[PDB]
């Protein structure tokens, strides 16, 4: 079994001068994501919102408007720095949902113990014709 890591709120943030591409009004009333990673030295990386930031030694904490920004930062950390990280979904009511490394290992590597949903056992051309599903509220591929 695998347990998700807790979001340690009192985690230091990278050195940054302040951008205009950061959080907006969506964070207060819908959602804002957050990414946490461990860096082995003080070095400069690129923000998903524009500009350069310096992440510090040890834990680094960065909140972002969208999950795609968090994954862009994570993939640039993994490629240009060989640094893994954790992404969390933080609701404004207080509940925090763990996100990307959901079962510990990365999704491109098998784990034996995942849900194989949305996997049809037919070919592309074996879907139903749209006339046979007429007036149903579903596309032919989700039958």
């Amino acid at each position: 079994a695998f347990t998700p890591p807790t979001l340690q709120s009192d985690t230091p943030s990278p050195i940054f001068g302040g951008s205009t591409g950061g959080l907006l009004s969506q964070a207060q009333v819908e959602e804002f994501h957050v990414i946490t990673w461990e860096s082995k030295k003080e070095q400069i990386f690129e923000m998903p919102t524009g500009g350069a930031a310096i992440m510090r030694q040890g834990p680094n904490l960065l909140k972002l408007a969208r999950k795609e920004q968090c994954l862009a930062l994570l993939t640039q950390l993994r490629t240009k720095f060989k640094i893994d990280g954790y992404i969390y979904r933080v609701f404004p009511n207080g509940e925090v949902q763990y996100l990307h490394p959901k079962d510990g290992v990365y999704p491109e590597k098998v784990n034996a113990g995942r849900s194989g949903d949305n996997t049809n056992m037919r070919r592309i051309g074996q879907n139903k014709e749209p006339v046979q599903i007429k007036f149903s509220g579903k596309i032919p591929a989700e039958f």
Binding site: T20, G21, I44, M47, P48, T49, G50, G51, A72
Partner: protein, 741 residues
């Protein structure tokens, strides 16, 4: 450290083996053309040296040799122009009578009835009337001979051969190393002094010893055959002392600093020479000498192999203020290691230079009998305007390319580039608001004028006769320039240009330059120009700033500078790349420059160009700009329909080629609309059906035919659009200005 010449002996062998195999420069083009997309990408990536090699040294060597090849092409072009001026031109005949004989330097072969394009220009000569102004330039240089144009053509051919030999030599025999290209201090010290300063000094020397005596005799009125040759004017100071008496004492007052005795040929009057309508050539001599001294002084600012001089890095890094953090930290490294950033800066200032050239050359003509030929004047202005706008768009493109490829956030922390990238939303939003405000307060003024004219309320529209909008700042600036001589310009005998104010300069019965009055229509069209320039800036700056990343697409730098989209998701991410921002900015630059040249042509056909009749000035269109250029129907009718009668009734005459191009460019412009409006999937499926038809008859190409890529389609569409629009305007302008004037 220590600026010196470093090269590599024989890096690249000279042979034809890579000529046999196209696509050798890039690895992605290997293993043959499986599709026609390979064919298109082969031309698309021919000059993209970053995708060919990762070494800055090889890129720099390729750039240097490409510059040499371009210089050879330009020298071939100059040789061709001088050869056509020598052999197939009426230049000597035009020199005798420049007021009435229309310049011509190209003739056609009678093959299919095309000999009708050989106009009755005059001087017993038949040929195409040229609008490039080589005749005026050659008269300014003091040619007045056919043999000298041929000698210059041969010399330019020799220089082209020298350029090509230099490029081959510097790519194949002695290719400079990377640190040779990075000596920006030495490069600036030699371009300021040895290129620009020495070139200006040498041209001042030529103008003193060739242009001044020959043009003085021409202005006094002498057939060019009996004018003494330039060398014998240069050979002895006797004839020069007859023409300019200060040459009797020679170089003695120069070295004793009694330079005021040289005031007969080193003058400062301003205005125009009344005989020719061009600038005083003595004033041009004085100008070139002064700027040559200034540039040679400027060429000693930077430090090379000796302790004197200031380093560019030191000057940059010390210009830091409280509002900007580290300031210019990193600018020296991203300009001595990235070619695209230098290309962006140089293209921007080069296009601005071309636009400034267009402005300063209509405002006050520098060549004799250039003002009177309205055709070459309008053509030169419009050509330099279009070159400037194109170069500016390319500057935006290469700034975006540098932002995508050569921008490293490590060495650009909290500097001006970082500071701008960290508040791009503010800049873009504010430019958007400025664009909307300018669009309203420029175009909606025209629409209000249209509505009030169409409602029968001429008292309610914005005009000089109703609700006035006077350019008070511009009018006061004209007054300041007109009152400048004798006050704030004590040594000036006349203003810089007659456009500020004063008397009408008339040469050969035609107005050389007369004062331009600004009213409500000029106010409206200047605000239209500001609006169009601001929107083009908005698109280009938005592409540059969001090339790296975005709220919608956070990893746009991974996808590259030139990619079509990131899929139909997020609502649709079509044209998110900086390339597509350049693609839209091309159309917007086209719109801006088109409105600028329309305003130029209408304003000077209505208020400047015309004939004198010893009681007034009869303009080409008759003052219709002041009462019709505030209304879109006025632009459509009194300018775009009234002046179009010359190009549509040009069949059966020498302007029939302009008439034909006027329709062919319409065809090309509307042909662009196929590529601009459609999409790749339709054409791919249609090509599939055609491939079925070919398979049925065993005529299928092994190279698979593919529809043009999305970026390919956009590029083809914008190229055809700009070509068609610019060629339509070119044919219209040239036919109108060569049929009437």
């Amino acid at each position: 450290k220590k600026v010196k010449i470093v090269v590599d002996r024989n890096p690249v062998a000279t042979n034809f083996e890579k000529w046999a195999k196209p696509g050798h420069f890039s690895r992605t083009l290997s293993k043959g053309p499986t599709t026609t997309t390979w064919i298109w990408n082969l031309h698309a990536d021919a000059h993209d040296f970053d995708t060919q090699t990762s070494d800055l040294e090889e890129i720099s060597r390729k750039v240097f040799s490409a510059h040499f090849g371009q210089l050879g092409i330009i020298f071939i072009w100059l040789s061709g122009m001088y050869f056509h001026g020598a052999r197939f031109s009426n230049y000597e005949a035009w020199l005798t009578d420049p007021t009435h004989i229309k310049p011509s330097a190209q003739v056609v072969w009678p093959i299919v009835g095309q000999e009708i394009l050989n106009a009755d220009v005059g001087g017993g000569f038949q040929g195409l009337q040229i609008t490039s102004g080589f005749f005026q330039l050659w008269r300014a240089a003091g040619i007045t001979s056919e043999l000298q144009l041929y000698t210059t053509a041969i010399g330019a051919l020799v220089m082209a051969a020298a350029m090509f030999f230099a490029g081959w030599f510097h790519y194949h025999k002695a290719a400079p190393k990377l640190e040779w290209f990075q000596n920006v201090e030495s490069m600036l010290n030699h371009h300021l002094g040895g290129l620009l300063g020495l070139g200006s000094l040498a041209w001042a020397g030529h103008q003193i010893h060739v242009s001044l005596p020959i043009n003085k005799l021409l202005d006094a009125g002498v057939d060019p055959k009996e004018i003494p040759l330039p060398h014998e004017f240069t050979l002895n100071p006797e004839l020069m002392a007859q023409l300019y008496p200060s040459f009797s004492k020679g170089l003695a007052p120069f070295f004793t600093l009694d330079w005021a005795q040289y005031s007969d040929f080193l003058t400062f009057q301003g205005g125009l020479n009344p005989v020719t309508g061009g600038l005083w050539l003595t004033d041009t001599v004085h100008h070139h000498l002064a700027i040559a001294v200034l540039f040679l002084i400027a060429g000693h600012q930077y430090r090379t192999n000796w302790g004197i001089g200031s380093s560019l890095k030191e000057i940059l890094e010390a210009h830091k203020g409280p509002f900007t953090g580290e300031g210019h930290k990193g600018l020296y490294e991203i300009l001595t290691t990235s070619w695209h950033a230098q290309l962006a800066i140089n293209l921007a200032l080069f296009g601005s230079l071309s636009i400034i050239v267009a402005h300063h050359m209509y405002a006050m003509p520098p060549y004799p009998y250039l003002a009177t030929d309205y055709g070459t004047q309008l053509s030169l202005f419009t050509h330099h305007m279009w070159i400037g706008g194109f170069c500016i768009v390319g500057a935006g493109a290469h700034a975006a390319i540098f932002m995508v490829r050569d921008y490293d956030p490590t060495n650009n922390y909290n500097n001006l580039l970082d500071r701008v990238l960290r508040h791009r939303d503010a800049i873009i939003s504010h430019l958007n608001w400025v664009c909307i405000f300018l669009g309203f307060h420029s175009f909606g003024l025209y629409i209000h004028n249209d509505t009030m004219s169409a409602l029968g309320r001429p008292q309610d529209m914005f005009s000089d006769t109703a609700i006035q909008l006077q350019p008070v700042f511009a009018q006061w600036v004209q007054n300041t320039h007109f009152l400048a001589p004798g006050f704030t310009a004590p040594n000036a005998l006349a203003s810089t240009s007659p456009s500020w104010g004063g008397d009408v300069v008339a040469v050969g019965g035609k107005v050389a330059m007369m004062p331009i009055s600004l009213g409500t229509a000029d106010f409206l069209v200047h605000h239209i120009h500001a609006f169009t320039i601001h929107v083009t800036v908005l698109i280009l700056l938005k592409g540059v700033l969001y090339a790296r990343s975005s709220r919608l697409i956070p990893d746009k730098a991974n996808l590259g500078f030139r990619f079509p989209c990131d899929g139909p998701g997020r609502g649709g991410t079509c044209q998110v790349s900086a390339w597509d921002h350049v693609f839209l900015g091309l159309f917007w630059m086209y719109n801006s420059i088109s409105i600028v040249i329309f305003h130029f042509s209408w304003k000077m056909q209505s208020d400047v160009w015309g004939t004198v009749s010893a009681n007034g000035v009869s303009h080409i269109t008759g003052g219709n700009f002041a009462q019709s250029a505030n209304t879109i129907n006025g632009w459509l009718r009194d300018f775009l329909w009234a002046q179009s009668s010359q190009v549509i009734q040009s069949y059966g005459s020498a302007l029939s080629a302009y008439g034909l191009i006027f329709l062919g460019a319409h065809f090309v412009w509307a042909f662009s609309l196929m590529f601009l409006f459609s999409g790749r999937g339709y054409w791919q499926e249609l090509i599939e059906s055609i491939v079925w038809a070919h398979n049925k008859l065993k005529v299928a190409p092994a190279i698979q035919p593919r529809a043009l890529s999305i970026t390919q389609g956009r590029a083809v569409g914008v190229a055809h659009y700009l070509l068609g629009g610019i060629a339509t305007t070119w044919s219209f302008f040239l036919a109108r200005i060569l049929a009437v004037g």
